[PDB]
């Protein structure tokens, strides 16, 4: 509603690494693929396997664990058979995030800016966060997703504000580059990124609205 006397009229959040931790959801996704393929389960104690799950993308993860001829095609078939709606409850909300939204609601406009395509609206519904955000920017709602400025430029047009009247909270370089190209002050969340502000806990956002 923007009742804040400070310069910030809206706070925009990235999803993965900022609102939620999806490691347990991504791990359960590949564990189920191993079970359907009759392969041994992945181990949390295996550093290389966990490095692959943290850094590699979906296609390259399957291409890595299934190098035997014919197995990759069956692995992609198993991945597409899994209903991701069963994996959303495995996502772990970042500590103090809902409490921070409750502190912001009515004081500033609230938005989401994610590179997710279909899942974001379902994530907000299942975690009861769909009462907070007036704009939910996804990859399916822009021609050019992050690190392009388009999604953040649509957020400024949505609230009818200037770039320096908004904050974008992100944990990745693509979040920072999108904010830089849009001219929106960036807030680094638990990340080593050059930013206007940084946060180690979500409760700090109430002090960055000046």
Q: Smallest distance from the beta carbon of 147 to Mg ion, in angstroms?
A: 12
Please list every residue in the chain followed by a chain break, i.e. its C lies more than 2.5 Å from the next written N.
none
With CB under 5 A as the contact rule, the residue among 171, 188, 202, 205 that binds Mg ion is 171
* CB-based burial, 159-184: b 16+ in 10 Å, e otherwise: bebebebbbbbbbbeebbbbbbebeb
94 contacts Mg ion (rule: CB under 5 A): no
Please indicate if the annotation marks 175 as binding a ligand.
Answer: yes
Question: Residue 22, interface with Mg ion (CB under 5 A)?
Answer: no
Q: How far apart are CA 74 and CA 34, in angstroms?
A: 11
Residue 172 in the binding site for Mg ion (CB under 5 A): yes
C-alpha separations of 57 from 62, 73, 143, 203 in Å: 9, 16, 21, 31
Q: Is residue 14 a contact point for Mg ion (CB under 5 A)?
A: yes
Distance of CA 32 to the CA centre of its chain: 23
User: Would the annotation count 14 as a binding residue?
Assistant: yes
The minimum distance between CB 170 and Mg ion, in angstroms, equals 6
Does residue number 17 form part of the binding site for Mg ion (CB under 5 A)? yes
Nearest distance in Å: CB 184, Mg ion: 16
Q: Which is nearer to Mg ion, 54 or 69 (CB)?
A: 54
Q: Per CB under 5 A, which region of 6-14, 46-54, 105-113, 122-130 contacts Mg ion?
A: 6-14
Q: How far is CA 5 from the centre of its chain?
A: 29
Angle, nearest 10°, between helix axes 173-182 and 150-159? 50
Q: Which residue has the tokens 């890595």?
A: 64
Three-state SS for 187?
Answer: strand
Q: Report how far Cα 42 is from the mean position of its chain's Cα atoms.
A: 24
> Segment contacting Mg ion (CB under 5 A): 22-30, 56-64, 85-93, 166-174?
166-174
Give the shortest CB-115-to-Mg ion separation in angstroms. 8
CB of 79 to Mg ion, least distance (A): 22
Nearer to Mg ion (CB atom), residue 9 or residue 176: 176
Q: Which is nearer to Mg ion, 119 or 172 (CB)?
A: 172
> Which parts of this chain interact with Mg ion (CB under 5 A)?
14, 16-17, 171-172
């Amino acid at each position: 509603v923007s009742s804040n006397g400070g310069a910030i009229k809206a706070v925009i959040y990235d999803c993965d690494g900022v609102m939620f931790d999806s490691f347990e959801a991504n791990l359960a996704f590949y564990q189920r693929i191993m079970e359907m393929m009759g392969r041994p389960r992945l181990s949390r104690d295996n550093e290389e396997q966990m490095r692959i799950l943290h850094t590699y993308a979906n296609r390259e993860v399957l291409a890595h664990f299934f190098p035997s001829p014919g197995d990759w095609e069956e692995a992609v078939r198993c991945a597409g058979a899994i209903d991701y709606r069963e994996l959303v409850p495995l996502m772990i909300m970042e500590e103090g995030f809902r409490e921070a939204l409750d502190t912001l609601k009515g004081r500033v406009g609230l938005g989401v800016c994610t590179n997710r395509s279909t899942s974001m609206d379902m994530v907000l519904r299942l975690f009861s966060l769909d009462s907070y955000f007036s704009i939910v920017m996804t990859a399916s709602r822009v021609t050019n997703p992050k690190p392009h400025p388009e999604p953040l430029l649509k957020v400024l047009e949505h609230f009818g504000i200037g770039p320096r009247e908004a904050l974008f909270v992100g944990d990745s370089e693509v979040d920072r580059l999108s904010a830089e190209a849009a001219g929106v002050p960036f807030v680094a969340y638990k990340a080593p990124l050059p930013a206007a502000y940084r946060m180690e806990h979500h409760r700090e956002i109430i002090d960055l609205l000046g």
